[PDB]
Amino acid sequence: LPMEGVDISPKQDEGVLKVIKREGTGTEMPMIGDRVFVHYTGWLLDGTKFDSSLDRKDKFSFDLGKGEVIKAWDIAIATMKVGEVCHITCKPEYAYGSAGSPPKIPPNATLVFEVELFEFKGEDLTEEEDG
Length: 131
Ligand SMILES: CN(C)c1cccc2c(S(=O)(=O)N3CCCC[C@H]3C(=O)N[C@@H](CCc3ccccc3)C(=O)N[C@@H](CCCNC(=N)N)C(=O)O)cccc12
Fold this sequence. Notes:
- By secondary structure, the protein is mainly β.
- The protein has one domain (1-131): Roll (Chitinase A, domain 3).
- Helices cover 5% and strands 36% of the residues.
- It contains one helix and eight strands, in the order βββββαβββ.
- It has one helix spanning 71-77; strands spanning 6-7, 16-22, 35-44, 49-52, 60-63, 85-90, 111-121, 126-128.
- Strands 1, 2, 3, 4, 5, 6, 7 and 8 form an eight-stranded antiparallel β-sheet that branches.
- Strand 7 and strand 8 (126-128) form a beta hairpin.
- The longest helix is centred in the middle third of the chain and has 7 residues, at 71-77.
- The structure holds ligand K0T.
- The site of ligand K0T has 12 residues, from strand 3 and helix 1.
- This is Peptidyl-prolyl cis-trans isomerase FKBP4.
- Residues 33-121 form the PPIase FKBP-type domain.
């Protein structure tokens, strides 16, 4: 239900909002091209849970800043520290726009995600939380 956070969109048009729920440790944030490992839960503004990696056997991974994930994610994950838990509000322009993604995402939908950054694999260094 709530759309909260700092506007972190490069154009500064409130397209991507972020709230840190748990501060991460370290100082390093993943770079463009780094492989990032997260756990997430995604909800529509009406509180409807459309997807969660927690329901699966391992973390969700992809290469940062390569357009493999919605724009909002490439923006938001680049601002995360390892061990950080945040809430991201994604406006449709930074998500699935007017088309949506049937059947779980309707047209012009604002998405809410709770994301935890577990690890990132850089060119020379890998950074992860303990476990
Ligand atoms: C394909 N279908 C059925 C879905 C599978 C899985 C998740 C889906 C989600 S989700 O839960 O909101 N999700 C996962 C992580 C958070 C972001 C978001 C996401 O992003 N996903 C990717 C697809 C990931 C995937 C995972 C497993 C199997 C297949 C696909 C996605 O859409 N990429 C877009 C990006 C276009 C970016 N242009 C641009 N100009 N930067 C695409 O390349 O077309 C929502 C809707 C469909 C989901």
